[PDB]
Amino acid sequence: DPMFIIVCYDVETITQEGRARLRKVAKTCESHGQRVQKSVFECQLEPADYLQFEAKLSKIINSKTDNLRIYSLDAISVSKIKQFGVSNI
Amino acid sequence: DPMFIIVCYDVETITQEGRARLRKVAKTCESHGQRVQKSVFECQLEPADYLQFEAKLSKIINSKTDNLRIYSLDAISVSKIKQFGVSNI
């Protein structure tokens, strides 16, 4: 029943403004899941809550600069997640 | 019949060696799909070819330094894939 969501956020983290945008997206995602890369998060949601969550992240980015890509997958979509190398940050 | 594959490669791009590792992953993924973000690619492969592909990416990375994450999905609707902002390289 619960949706599995991969959030991929490409934003510059040289400027304080850009670091703050990434911090804000991280903090939205981490109350529904886990940070797996600097800018990749895995979340679980009831489908009912999805749209509000999508709007929340959307509103945070600079749409003239940044890229946000969200995969909203059915539970059964995913057969295998394979990790390589090192797991911190 | 073929699997949908999200490749997420988190590598430092401060050193020439690190930029080169990202370039080499990109070039492997782009003969099987599309670069959709700086460090995210979408690929399609028949199962037999998956393992050889997974080994090829694995071999390229610094396993002590980089993070490579491969999602193996059953085929999804394009409607499950949401984008916001621009594609700026």
Residue numbers in the entry:
A (entry chain A), B (entry chain B): -1 to 87
Question: What's written in the study?
Answer:
The genome of pathogenic Leptospira interrogans serovars (Copenhageni and Lai) are predicted to have CRISPR-Cas of subtypes I-B and I-C. Cas2, one of the core Cas proteins, has a crucial role in adaptive defense against foreign nucleic acids. The Cas2 proteins (80–120 residues) are core metallonucleases found universally in all CRISPR-bearing taxa. In Leptospira, the CRISPR-Cas subtype I-C lacks the CRISPR array component and is thus considered an orphan CRISPR-Cas system. Unlike Cas2 from other organisms, the purified rLinCas2C and rLinCas2C_Lai exhibited metal-dependent DNase and metal-independent RNase activity.
The crystal structure of rLinCas2C obtained at the resolution of 2.60 Å revealed the protein is in apostate conformation and contains N- (1–71 amino acids) and C-terminal (72–90 amino acids) regions, with the former possessing a ferredoxin fold. The crystal structure of rLinCas2C encloses the signature N-terminal ferredoxin domain (βαββαβ). LinCas2C crystal is composed of a total of three α-helices (α1–α3) and five anti-parallel β-strands (β1–β5) for the Cas2 orthologs enlisted in Table 2. In rLinCas2C, upon dimerization, the buried surface area is 3,430 Å2, identified by PDBePISA. A total of 33 hydrogen bonds were formed between two protomers of LinCas2C as analyzed by Coot. The rLinCas2C dimer demonstrates that the β5 strand (6 residues) of one protomer bridges with the β4 strand (5 residues) of another protomer by 8–10 hydrogen bonds and several other residues enlisted in Supplementary Table S2. The crystal structure of rLinCas2C (dimeric form) indicates it is in a catalytically inactive conformational state as the distance between the conserved Asp8 residue of each protomer is 11.0 Å (as opposed to 6.5 Å in SsoCas2). The distance of 11.0 Å seems too far to coordinate a single Mg2+ ion of the protein. For these aspartates to bind a bridging metal, the rLinCas2C would need to undergo either a major conformational change of the β1 or ferredoxin fold region or altogether the dimer orientation. The mapping of the surface electrostatic potential of rLinCas2C demonstrated the presence of a positive charge at the putative nucleic acid substrate-binding loop (L1 and L2) and the α1 region. In LinCas2C, alanine replacement mutation of conserved residues Tyr7, Asp8, Arg33, and Phe39 and loop L2 abolishes DNase activity, whereas moderate reduction of RNase activity was evident in selected mutants.
